[PDB]
Amino acid sequence: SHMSGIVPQLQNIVSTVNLGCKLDLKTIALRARNAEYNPKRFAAVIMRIREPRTTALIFSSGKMVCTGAKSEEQSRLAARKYARVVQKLGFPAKFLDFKIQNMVGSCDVKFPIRLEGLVLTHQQFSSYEPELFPGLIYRMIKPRIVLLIFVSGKVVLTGAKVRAEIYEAFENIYPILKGFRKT
Amino acid sequence: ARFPPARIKKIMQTDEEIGKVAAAVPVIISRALELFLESLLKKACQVTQSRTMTTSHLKQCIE
Amino acid sequence: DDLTIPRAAINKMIKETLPNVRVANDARELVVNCCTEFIHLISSEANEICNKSEKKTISPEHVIQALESLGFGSYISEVKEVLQECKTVALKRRKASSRLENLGIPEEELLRQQQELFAKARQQQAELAQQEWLQ
DNA sequence: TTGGCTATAAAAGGGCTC
DNA sequence: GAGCCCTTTTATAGCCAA
Numbered sequence: 001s002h003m004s005g006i007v008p009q010l011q012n013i014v015s016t017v018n019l020g021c022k023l024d025l026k027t028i029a030l031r032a033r034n035a036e037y038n039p040k041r042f043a044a045v046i047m048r049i050r051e052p053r054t055t056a057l058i059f060s061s062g063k064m065v066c067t068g069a070k071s072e073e074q075s076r077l078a079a080r081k082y083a084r085v086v087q088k089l090g091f092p093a094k095f096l097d098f099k100i101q102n103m104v105g106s107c108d109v110k111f112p113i114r115l116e117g118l119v120l121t122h123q124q125f126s127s128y129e130p131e132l133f134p135g136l137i138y139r140m141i142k143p144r145i146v147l148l149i150f151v152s153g154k155v156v157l158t159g160a161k162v163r164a165e166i167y168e169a170f171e172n173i174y175p176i177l178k179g180f181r182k183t
Numbered sequence: 184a185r186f187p188p189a190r191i192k193k194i195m196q197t198d199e200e201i202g203k204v205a206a207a208v209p210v211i212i213s214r215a216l217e218l219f220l221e222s223l224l225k226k227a228c229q230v231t232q233s234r235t236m237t238t239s240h241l242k243q244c245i246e
Numbered sequence: 247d248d249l250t251i252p253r254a255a256i257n258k259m260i261k262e263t264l265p266n267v268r269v270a271n272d273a274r275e276l277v278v279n280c281c282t283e284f285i286h287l288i289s290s291e292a293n294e295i296c297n298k299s300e301k302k303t304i305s306p307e308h309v310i311q312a313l314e315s316l317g318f319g320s321y322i323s324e325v326k327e328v329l330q331e332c333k334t335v336a337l338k339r340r341k342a343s344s345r346l347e348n349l350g351i352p353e354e355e356l357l358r359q360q361q362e363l364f365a366k367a368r369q370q371q372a373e374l375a376q377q378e379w380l381q
Numbered sequence: 382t383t384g385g386c387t388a389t390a391a392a393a394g395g396g397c398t399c
Numbered sequence: 400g401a402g403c404c405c406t407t408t409t410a411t412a413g414c415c416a417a
Contacts, residue, residue: 001372012409016392040202042406043395055407057393065392067408102391106410125360133388134413141357146389148411156410159390175367184259186251186281189386194282195289197247202293203303203396206404207332211306212288214328215313216251217259218321219284220277224263235268241276245283253417271417278417303396303404337399340403 004174008105008157008166013069016101017079019062019086020094028058028089047082054078058086065101072100072163102159105166109153109174112182118149122176138173145169149177186213251281291316306332 025045029037036046045058054068056078064082069075076098087093115136119128127137135156138147143165148156155173160166188209195201195209223244230240256278260269289304291312296304306329313321350356 001375014391059393104409141360150411154411172364175371178371179367184255186255190251194249194285200293201289205303205305207306208304208309210332211309211325211328214325215321216281216284220259221263228264235270236273237270238272238276241273
Protein backbone atom coordinates (compact mmCIF):
# COMPACT_ATOMS: atom_id res chain seq x y z
CA SER A 1 0.00 0.00 0.00
CA HIS A 2 2.70 2.51 0.96
CA MET A 3 6.45 2.98 0.67
CA SER A 4 8.43 3.43 3.89
CA GLY A 5 9.00 7.05 2.98
CA ILE A 6 12.51 6.67 4.34
CA VAL A 7 15.35 6.67 1.82
CA PRO A 8 18.63 5.07 3.03
CA GLN A 9 21.67 7.26 2.52
CA LEU A 10 24.98 6.08 1.12
CA GLN A 11 27.82 6.22 3.68
CA ASN A 12 30.60 4.26 1.96
CA ILE A 13 31.68 2.77 -1.33
CA VAL A 14 34.39 0.35 -2.28
CA SER A 15 35.46 0.26 -5.90
CA THR A 16 38.38 -1.26 -7.72
CA VAL A 17 40.21 -0.20 -10.83
CA ASN A 18 43.17 -1.77 -12.64
CA LEU A 19 45.86 0.73 -13.64
CA GLY A 20 47.34 -1.90 -15.95
CA CYS A 21 51.08 -1.57 -15.31
CA LYS A 22 53.53 -2.82 -12.69
CA LEU A 23 54.16 -0.31 -9.91
CA ASP A 24 57.05 0.21 -7.50
CA LEU A 25 55.46 1.10 -4.18
CA LYS A 26 58.84 2.09 -2.71
CA THR A 27 59.08 4.77 -5.40
CA ILE A 28 55.46 5.91 -5.05
CA ALA A 29 55.61 6.07 -1.26
CA LEU A 30 58.85 7.99 -1.58
CA ARG A 31 57.44 11.06 -3.35
CA ALA A 32 53.67 10.81 -3.00
CA ARG A 33 52.62 13.41 -0.42
CA ASN A 34 50.04 11.62 1.76
CA ALA A 35 51.31 8.09 1.09
CA GLU A 36 52.06 5.33 3.59
CA TYR A 37 53.98 2.12 3.02
CA ASN A 38 55.20 -0.77 5.20
CA PRO A 39 55.70 -3.86 3.10
CA LYS A 40 56.49 -5.02 6.62
CA ARG A 41 52.86 -4.80 7.82
CA PHE A 42 50.85 -4.42 4.59
CA ALA A 43 51.88 -5.09 0.99
CA ALA A 44 50.35 -1.95 -0.52
CA VAL A 45 50.62 1.81 -0.63
CA ILE A 46 47.95 3.66 1.34
CA MET A 47 47.18 6.97 -0.32
CA ARG A 48 44.48 9.44 0.64
CA ILE A 49 42.91 12.58 -0.82
CA ARG A 50 40.75 15.32 0.68
CA GLU A 51 38.16 15.57 -2.11
CA PRO A 52 36.44 13.32 -2.48
CA ARG A 53 37.56 12.33 1.02
CA THR A 54 38.81 8.81 0.42
CA THR A 55 41.56 6.24 0.71
CA ALA A 56 43.13 4.06 -1.94
CA LEU A 57 45.12 0.85 -1.56
CA ILE A 58 47.63 0.61 -4.41
CA PHE A 59 49.21 -2.74 -5.12
CA SER A 60 52.27 -3.77 -7.14
CA SER A 61 50.21 -5.30 -9.92
CA GLY A 62 48.82 -1.87 -10.67
CA LYS A 63 45.42 -2.88 -9.31
CA MET A 64 43.91 -0.50 -6.79
CA VAL A 65 41.09 -0.38 -4.22
CA CYS A 66 39.26 2.87 -3.49
CA THR A 67 37.19 3.35 -0.31
CA GLY A 68 35.32 6.11 1.50
CA ALA A 69 33.15 7.67 -1.23
CA LYS A 70 29.46 8.53 -0.63
CA SER A 71 28.29 7.97 -4.20
CA GLU A 72 29.13 6.00 -7.36
CA GLU A 73 30.58 8.89 -9.37
CA GLN A 74 32.34 10.34 -6.34
CA SER A 75 34.14 7.01 -6.03
CA ARG A 76 34.98 7.00 -9.74
CA LEU A 77 36.34 10.53 -9.48
CA ALA A 78 38.56 9.75 -6.48
CA ALA A 79 39.68 6.65 -8.34
CA ARG A 80 40.70 8.88 -11.26
CA LYS A 81 42.65 11.34 -9.11
CA TYR A 82 44.58 8.40 -7.65
CA ALA A 83 45.22 7.31 -11.23
CA ARG A 84 46.58 10.67 -12.33
CA VAL A 85 48.71 10.76 -9.21
CA VAL A 86 50.38 7.44 -9.99
CA GLN A 87 50.53 8.87 -13.50
CA LYS A 88 52.41 12.08 -12.73
CA LEU A 89 54.81 10.08 -10.57
CA GLY A 90 56.13 8.68 -13.83
CA PHE A 91 54.09 5.55 -14.44
CA PRO A 92 52.13 4.37 -17.55
CA ALA A 93 48.80 4.73 -15.70
CA LYS A 94 45.63 3.64 -17.49
CA PHE A 95 42.09 3.49 -16.02
CA LEU A 96 40.66 0.01 -16.65
CA ASP A 97 37.67 -2.01 -15.47
CA PHE A 98 36.38 0.35 -12.81
CA LYS A 99 33.80 -1.53 -10.74
CA ILE A 100 31.78 -0.73 -7.62
CA GLN A 101 32.42 -3.72 -5.32
CA ASN A 102 30.41 -2.72 -2.26
CA MET A 103 28.04 -0.03 -1.06
CA VAL A 104 26.96 0.80 2.46
CA GLY A 105 23.76 2.61 3.34
CA SER A 106 22.02 3.71 6.56
CA CYS A 107 18.77 5.20 7.85
CA ASP A 108 16.51 5.60 10.86
CA VAL A 109 13.05 4.02 11.18
CA LYS A 110 12.52 6.39 14.12
CA PHE A 111 11.29 3.90 16.75
CA PRO A 112 12.74 1.22 19.09
CA ILE A 113 12.84 -2.41 17.95
CA ARG A 114 12.31 -5.77 19.70
CA LEU A 115 15.43 -7.53 18.41
CA GLU A 116 14.69 -10.23 20.99
CA GLY A 117 11.67 -11.42 19.02
CA LEU A 118 12.89 -10.76 15.46
CA VAL A 119 15.68 -13.25 16.09
CA LEU A 120 13.01 -15.85 16.89
CA THR A 121 10.56 -15.38 14.03
CA HIS A 122 13.49 -15.06 11.59
CA GLN A 123 16.18 -17.04 13.43
CA GLN A 124 17.41 -18.66 10.21
CA PHE A 125 18.26 -15.21 8.83
CA SER A 126 19.38 -13.56 12.10
CA SER A 127 22.32 -13.61 14.49
CA TYR A 128 21.74 -11.74 17.77
CA GLU A 129 24.24 -11.86 20.64
CA PRO A 130 24.11 -8.56 22.57
CA GLU A 131 26.95 -9.91 24.71
CA LEU A 132 29.10 -9.91 21.57
CA PHE A 133 27.49 -7.14 19.50
CA PRO A 134 24.60 -4.76 20.40
CA GLY A 135 22.93 -5.02 17.00
CA LEU A 136 20.99 -7.75 15.24
CA ILE A 137 22.65 -9.09 12.05
CA TYR A 138 20.10 -9.82 9.30
CA ARG A 139 21.03 -11.74 6.14
CA MET A 140 18.63 -11.08 3.26
CA ILE A 141 18.76 -13.57 0.35
CA LYS A 142 17.19 -11.46 -2.42
CA PRO A 143 18.67 -9.10 -2.90
CA ARG A 144 21.77 -10.48 -1.16
CA ILE A 145 22.55 -7.81 1.40
CA VAL A 146 23.34 -7.80 5.13
CA LEU A 147 21.56 -5.52 7.58
CA LEU A 148 22.62 -4.32 11.01
CA ILE A 149 19.53 -3.52 13.04
CA PHE A 150 19.79 -1.68 16.34
CA VAL A 151 17.33 -1.40 19.23
CA SER A 152 17.23 2.35 18.53
CA GLY A 153 15.73 1.93 15.07
CA LYS A 154 18.92 2.91 13.27
CA VAL A 155 19.64 0.49 10.44
CA VAL A 156 22.70 -0.21 8.37
CA LEU A 157 22.64 -1.98 5.01
CA THR A 158 25.72 -3.41 3.28
CA GLY A 159 26.89 -5.85 0.63
CA ALA A 160 25.25 -4.15 -2.38
CA LYS A 161 26.72 -3.95 -5.88
CA VAL A 162 24.22 -1.31 -7.06
CA ARG A 163 22.23 1.12 -4.90
CA ALA A 164 18.87 -0.35 -6.01
CA GLU A 165 19.68 -3.48 -3.97
CA ILE A 166 19.93 -1.31 -0.85
CA TYR A 167 16.56 0.37 -1.48
CA GLU A 168 15.00 -3.01 -2.21
CA ALA A 169 16.39 -4.50 1.00
CA PHE A 170 15.18 -1.65 3.18
CA GLU A 171 11.70 -1.59 1.67
CA ASN A 172 11.48 -5.32 2.43
CA ILE A 173 12.62 -4.96 6.06
CA TYR A 174 10.61 -1.87 6.98
CA PRO A 175 7.28 -3.65 7.40
CA ILE A 176 9.04 -6.42 9.34
CA LEU A 177 10.58 -3.81 11.64
CA LYS A 178 7.20 -2.14 12.22
CA GLY A 179 5.88 -5.55 13.23
CA PHE A 180 8.49 -5.71 15.97
CA ARG A 181 8.19 -2.16 17.22
CA LYS A 182 8.84 -1.84 20.95
CA THR A 183 6.43 -0.15 23.37
CA ALA B 184 43.38 -15.03 33.90
CA ARG B 185 43.25 -14.74 30.07
CA PHE B 186 44.48 -11.63 28.29
CA PRO B 187 43.07 -9.60 25.31
CA PRO B 188 44.78 -10.94 22.16
CA ALA B 189 43.86 -7.78 20.24
CA ARG B 190 45.64 -5.73 22.91
CA ILE B 191 48.56 -8.18 22.89
CA LYS B 192 48.96 -7.82 19.11
CA LYS B 193 48.76 -4.04 19.32
CA ILE B 194 51.43 -4.14 22.04
CA MET B 195 53.65 -6.48 19.98
CA GLN B 196 53.51 -4.08 17.05
CA THR B 197 54.68 -1.08 19.06
CA ASP B 198 57.94 -2.53 17.74
CA GLU B 199 58.63 -1.37 14.17
CA GLU B 200 60.71 -4.48 13.48
CA ILE B 201 57.81 -6.84 14.09
CA GLY B 202 56.08 -7.60 10.81
CA LYS B 203 52.94 -9.67 10.30
CA VAL B 204 52.03 -12.07 13.11
CA ALA B 205 49.93 -15.27 12.94
CA ALA B 206 46.44 -14.87 14.47
CA ALA B 207 47.03 -17.70 16.95
CA VAL B 208 50.30 -16.16 18.23
CA PRO B 209 48.79 -13.50 20.52
CA VAL B 210 46.70 -16.17 22.23
CA ILE B 211 49.66 -18.39 23.08
CA ILE B 212 51.59 -15.35 24.26
CA SER B 213 48.58 -14.71 26.47
CA ARG B 214 48.98 -18.19 28.01
CA ALA B 215 52.69 -17.57 28.32
CA LEU B 216 52.03 -14.20 29.96
CA GLU B 217 49.72 -16.04 32.34
CA LEU B 218 52.41 -18.62 33.26
CA PHE B 219 54.95 -15.83 33.72
CA LEU B 220 52.79 -13.88 36.16
CA GLU B 221 51.96 -16.92 38.27
CA SER B 222 55.63 -17.87 38.55
CA LEU B 223 56.63 -14.24 39.14
CA LEU B 224 53.96 -13.36 41.71
CA LYS B 225 54.61 -16.59 43.62
CA LYS B 226 58.30 -15.79 43.92
CA ALA B 227 57.67 -12.18 44.88
CA CYS B 228 55.22 -13.49 47.46
CA GLN B 229 58.06 -15.50 48.97
CA VAL B 230 60.24 -12.38 49.06
CA THR B 231 57.39 -10.48 50.71
CA GLN B 232 56.89 -13.05 53.48
CA SER B 233 60.63 -12.82 54.23
CA ARG B 234 60.38 -9.16 55.27
CA THR B 235 51.61 -6.37 51.80
CA MET B 236 53.59 -6.95 48.58
CA THR B 237 55.53 -3.90 47.39
CA THR B 238 57.29 -2.58 44.29
CA SER B 239 60.62 -3.75 45.73
CA HIS B 240 59.62 -7.37 46.42
CA LEU B 241 58.75 -7.55 42.72
CA LYS B 242 61.73 -5.83 41.11
CA GLN B 243 64.01 -8.36 42.83
CA CYS B 244 62.46 -10.92 40.48
CA ILE B 245 63.22 -9.02 37.26
CA GLU B 246 66.85 -8.57 38.34
CA ASP C 247 52.43 3.41 22.32
CA ASP C 248 51.08 3.40 25.89
CA LEU C 249 49.03 0.23 25.48
CA THR C 250 48.96 -2.07 28.48
CA ILE C 251 46.93 -5.09 29.50
CA PRO C 252 43.80 -3.97 31.44
CA ARG C 253 44.38 -3.36 35.15
CA ALA C 254 41.40 -5.55 35.91
CA ALA C 255 43.02 -8.52 34.14
CA ILE C 256 46.12 -8.24 36.32
CA ASN C 257 44.01 -7.87 39.45
CA LYS C 258 42.01 -10.97 38.66
CA MET C 259 45.32 -12.78 38.16
CA ILE C 260 46.75 -11.58 41.48
CA LYS C 261 43.56 -12.60 43.31
CA GLU C 262 43.44 -16.04 41.67
CA THR C 263 47.14 -16.64 42.29
CA LEU C 264 47.76 -15.00 45.67
CA PRO C 265 44.53 -15.62 47.61
CA ASN C 266 44.66 -13.37 50.69
CA VAL C 267 47.72 -11.23 49.93
CA ARG C 268 47.56 -7.44 50.08
CA VAL C 269 49.35 -6.05 47.05
CA ALA C 270 50.34 -2.38 46.93
CA ASN C 271 48.66 -0.37 44.15
CA ASP C 272 52.19 0.70 43.19
CA ALA C 273 53.25 -2.93 42.77
CA ARG C 274 50.10 -3.69 40.80
CA GLU C 275 51.30 -1.03 38.37
CA LEU C 276 54.66 -2.76 38.09
CA VAL C 277 53.06 -6.09 37.14
CA VAL C 278 50.90 -4.40 34.50
CA ASN C 279 54.14 -3.03 33.07
CA CYS C 280 56.13 -6.28 33.37
CA CYS C 281 53.42 -7.67 31.12
CA THR C 282 54.23 -5.34 28.27
CA GLU C 283 57.96 -5.92 28.79
CA PHE C 284 57.50 -9.68 28.53
CA ILE C 285 55.41 -9.35 25.36
CA HIS C 286 58.25 -7.30 23.84
CA LEU C 287 60.87 -9.78 25.06
CA ILE C 288 59.11 -12.81 23.57
CA SER C 289 58.19 -10.94 20.37
CA SER C 290 61.71 -9.66 19.68
CA GLU C 291 63.24 -13.10 20.15
CA ALA C 292 60.49 -14.67 18.04
CA ASN C 293 60.95 -12.06 15.34
CA GLU C 294 64.61 -13.06 15.01
CA ILE C 295 63.98 -16.78 15.12
CA CYS C 296 61.56 -15.90 12.30
CA ASN C 297 63.89 -14.01 9.95
CA LYS C 298 66.22 -16.99 10.19
CA SER C 299 63.39 -19.43 9.39
CA GLU C 300 63.17 -17.87 5.92
CA LYS C 301 59.52 -17.13 6.71
CA LYS C 302 57.62 -13.84 6.75
CA THR C 303 55.04 -14.19 9.50
CA ILE C 304 55.84 -14.91 13.14
CA SER C 305 54.24 -18.31 13.65
CA PRO C 306 53.18 -20.12 16.85
CA GLU C 307 56.35 -22.16 16.35
CA HIS C 308 58.70 -19.18 16.41
CA VAL C 309 57.07 -18.21 19.71
CA ILE C 310 57.61 -21.66 21.18
CA GLN C 311 61.27 -21.65 20.16
CA ALA C 312 61.77 -18.16 21.59
CA LEU C 313 60.32 -19.36 24.90
CA GLU C 314 62.80 -22.26 25.13
CA SER C 315 65.60 -20.05 23.85
CA LEU C 316 64.81 -17.29 26.34
CA GLY C 317 64.78 -19.63 29.33
CA PHE C 318 61.04 -20.24 29.57
CA GLY C 319 61.19 -23.81 28.34
CA SER C 320 58.96 -25.00 31.19
CA TYR C 321 55.96 -23.20 29.63
CA ILE C 322 56.14 -25.04 26.32
CA SER C 323 53.87 -27.74 27.80
CA GLU C 324 50.83 -25.58 28.56
CA VAL C 325 51.58 -23.38 25.56
CA LYS C 326 51.45 -26.35 23.19
CA GLU C 327 47.98 -27.20 24.52
CA VAL C 328 46.69 -23.70 23.75
CA LEU C 329 48.23 -23.83 20.29
CA GLN C 330 46.28 -27.05 19.84
CA GLU C 331 42.85 -25.74 20.81
CA CYS C 332 43.66 -22.87 18.44
CA LYS C 333 44.15 -25.24 15.51
CA THR C 334 41.06 -27.16 16.53
CA VAL C 335 38.97 -23.99 16.86
CA ALA C 336 40.15 -22.86 13.44
CA LEU C 337 39.46 -26.29 11.99
CA LYS C 338 35.94 -26.53 13.41
CA ARG C 339 35.20 -23.03 12.16
CA ARG C 340 36.39 -23.97 8.65
CA LYS C 341 34.16 -27.02 8.55
CA ALA C 342 31.19 -25.07 9.91
CA SER C 343 31.47 -22.55 7.05
CA SER C 344 31.84 -25.36 4.52
CA ARG C 345 28.52 -26.83 5.68
CA LEU C 346 26.77 -23.49 5.90
CA GLU C 347 27.63 -22.90 2.25
CA ASN C 348 27.24 -26.46 1.01
CA LEU C 349 24.88 -28.57 3.09
CA GLY C 350 22.17 -26.16 4.18
CA ILE C 351 18.56 -25.92 3.02
CA PRO C 352 18.82 -25.11 -0.70
CA GLU C 353 18.78 -21.33 -1.20
CA GLU C 354 15.60 -21.70 -3.25
CA GLU C 355 13.46 -22.75 -0.23
CA LEU C 356 15.31 -20.40 2.11
CA LEU C 357 14.38 -17.56 -0.20
CA ARG C 358 10.75 -18.71 -0.28
CA GLN C 359 10.57 -18.97 3.48
CA GLN C 360 12.01 -15.49 3.84
CA GLN C 361 9.77 -13.96 1.20
CA GLU C 362 6.77 -15.50 2.95
CA LEU C 363 7.66 -13.62 6.12
CA PHE C 364 8.14 -10.47 4.02
CA ALA C 365 4.87 -10.63 2.07
CA LYS C 366 3.04 -11.60 5.23
CA ALA C 367 4.40 -8.58 7.10
CA ARG C 368 3.41 -6.28 4.22
CA GLN C 369 -0.08 -7.73 4.53
CA GLN C 370 -0.30 -7.03 8.26
CA GLN C 371 0.95 -3.44 8.07
CA ALA C 372 -1.32 -3.11 5.06
CA GLU C 373 -4.44 -3.81 7.13
CA LEU C 374 -3.28 -2.21 10.37
CA ALA C 375 -2.68 0.85 8.17
CA GLN C 376 -5.83 0.85 6.03
CA GLN C 377 -7.96 0.18 9.11
CA GLU C 378 -6.51 3.11 11.06
CA TRP C 379 -7.04 5.06 7.84
CA LEU C 380 -10.74 4.23 8.00
CA GLN C 381 -11.15 6.52 11.02
C1' DT D 382 34.41 12.65 25.27
C1' DT D 383 37.81 9.82 22.87
C1' DG D 384 38.84 5.80 20.83
C1' DG D 385 39.51 0.70 20.57
C1' DC D 386 37.17 -3.91 20.95
C1' DT D 387 33.11 -6.34 18.97
C1' DA D 388 30.14 -6.94 13.89
C1' DT D 389 29.13 -6.63 8.18
C1' DA D 390 30.19 -6.34 3.06
C1' DA D 391 34.16 -6.27 -0.49
C1' DA D 392 38.43 -6.00 -3.32
C1' DA D 393 43.53 -6.50 -3.57
C1' DG D 394 47.64 -10.31 -2.90
C1' DG D 395 51.42 -12.71 -0.24
C1' DG D 396 51.42 -15.74 3.65
C1' DC D 397 49.62 -20.13 5.52
C1' DT D 398 46.89 -24.66 7.11
C1' DC D 399 44.39 -29.42 5.77
C1' DG E 400 44.50 -25.62 -4.57
C1' DA E 401 40.02 -24.12 -1.42
C1' DG E 402 39.77 -20.54 1.71
C1' DC E 403 41.03 -17.81 6.10
C1' DC E 404 44.32 -13.79 7.59
C1' DC E 405 45.68 -9.01 7.41
C1' DT E 406 44.51 -3.67 5.77
C1' DT E 407 41.05 0.23 4.58
C1' DT E 408 36.36 2.38 4.96
C1' DT E 409 31.61 3.36 7.34
C1' DA E 410 27.04 3.54 9.66
C1' DT E 411 25.63 1.81 14.43
C1' DA E 412 26.42 1.01 19.46
C1' DG E 413 27.16 -1.32 24.09
C1' DC E 414 31.38 -2.40 26.99
C1' DC E 415 35.77 -0.84 28.65
C1' DA E 416 39.69 2.26 30.18
C1' DA E 417 42.26 2.23 36.70
